[PDB]
Design a protein around this ligand. Structure first.
Ligand SMILES: O=C(O)c1cc(=O)[nH]c(=O)n1[C@@H]1O[C@H](COP(=O)(O)O)[C@@H](O)[C@H]1O
Ligand SMILES: O=c1ccn([C@@H]2O[C@H](COP(=O)(O)O)[C@@H](O)[C@H]2O)c(=O)[nH]1
Lengths: 256, 256
């Protein structure tokens, strides 16, 4: 097993993955903030205050009540300042011809500001081919959703294996996975795991939580994605630091 | 086998399904226009000219370069005038807590103007439970994606069966399917089929086409969804009439 810093230098590493792995090592963070807020001002205040603690800020641009492209310019300024990637959790899941337009165009122009997006594999590899025709020229990366945190997820067994094959066949654009665990044996790929809180529990709409120690240390994932465990806390900076220290120590203890 | 008009009266029919089935019977159309355009003016000019020929207009609001809620108000005026439903093909595919926000909020406020939306079943039934919390109070309906038209689709076998079970267990909100065929034996559910053109072929990003006679007549679906077969034609009105007459006669000949 290699450190994040050594994985950043692997021969087959994608440039976006390399940039991420280098800043994870530099800052001692494998925490992705899930910035699940509706106000631009709260998004930007969280990005500024928590920027030093995170490797990545995950957005749902389509729940922002006051989205503008100027908000995303301000988020990029903070991402450059504090050194984190922007990941739009859009979960592209349509035919290739449609997702290319959803990624490049419309109001959001996601490809113009998102370092990373993700896609479901259920439509077949056309979803990746469509995205990559916008994303490759714009030097972007993509994550494939191999496993899901929610109750009743059908992303198991042969489905998860299909996601890994699709990733490993589109390595010029696909840099890793949304997963609950290590699903690829190839160290070039990133594993990002949502459904994370320090305490046992869930929500009322099928979310299930596991701890950073479980998902990073026992299940072998790289990055924790944390929304409400941070966002709903009074002191979101201290909460981010608790999640960062948990995920980072779990990573170190697997390295030996 | 019952006519659309008789299905509109079934005891367990959803009000949105009933409204749709009644206008399908009245207008002799089981054509859904896939209005895959980037300009509001072209969307509205197609909705006005083709409105009499269609039971439904399917949108991808996120590819409209000049989206505003006022555009949606003008589309509703045309939907009411010509009698068709509005279906936003958003393919919700996240945890329940997230999709509720994506459906009600952000800049699109999809639930405010869309009669119908759709969802992938891969996250488990929480996706439906989250949507239905917004959609039930707003008197909306949902379609579940049981089969996909694209090459390499994983929506087959047990996945398709899981989509049908999820629909039949959430019948207060789920009114039917995106599918390539009849997948439910319950006549209360609508089957809408994309990947339709009069000529054999596909696109360069995994889209596969079948004819209206094949999907309505042989595969037993209710509604054809047609994008480029109409939108790329010079005369979109005559193209819509060709598709309407094809789908309607295929339906009649299955009835006897
Ligand atoms: O792609 C995602 O990040 C995602 C995948 C998944 O399997 N589960 C999941 O919860 N998510 C997202 O990650 C976040 C989880 O948020 P919390 O439950 O608040 O920590 C939400 O924004 C979800 O939309
Ligand atoms: O299985 C599916 C589901 C949706 N769709 C959508 O239907 C439309 C098909 O358009 P087309 O006729 O131009 O190929 C397009 O908007 C797709 O996003 C499919 O093509 N297949």
């Amino acid at each position: 097993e290699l450190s994040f810093g050594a994985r950043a230098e692997l021969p087959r590493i994608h440039p976006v993955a390399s940039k991420l792995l280098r800043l994870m090592q530099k800052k001692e963070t494998n925490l992705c903030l899930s910035a699940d807020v509706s106000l631009a001002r709260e998004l930007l205040q969280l990005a500024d205050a928590l920027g030093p603690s995170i490797c990545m800020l995950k957005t749902h641009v389509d729940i922002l009540n006051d989205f503008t492209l100027d908000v995303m310019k301000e988020l990029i300024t903070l991402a450059k300042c504090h050194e984190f990637l922007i990941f739009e959790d859009r979960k592209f899941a349509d035919i290739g011809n449609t997702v290319k337009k959803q990624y490049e165009g419309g109001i959001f122009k996601i490809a113009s500001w998102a370092d990373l997006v993700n896609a479901h594999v259920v439509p077949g590899s056309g979803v990746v081919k469509g995205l990559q025709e916008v994303g490759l020229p714009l030097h972007r990366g993509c994550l494939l959703i191999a496993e899901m945190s929610s109750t009743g997820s059908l992303a198991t067994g042969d489905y998860t294996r299909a996601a890994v094959r699709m990733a490993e066949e589109h390595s010029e654009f696909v840099v890793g996975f949304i997963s609950g665990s290590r699903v690829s044996m190839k160290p070039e790929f990133l594993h990002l795991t949502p459904g994370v809180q320090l305490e046992a529990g869930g929500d009322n709409l099928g979310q299930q939580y596991n701890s950073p120690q479980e998902v990073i240390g026992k299940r072998g994932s790289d990055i924790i994605i944390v929304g409400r465990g941070i966002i709903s806390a009074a002191d979101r900076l201290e909460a981010a630091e608790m999640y960062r220290k948990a995920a980072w120590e779990a990573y170190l203890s697997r390295l030996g």
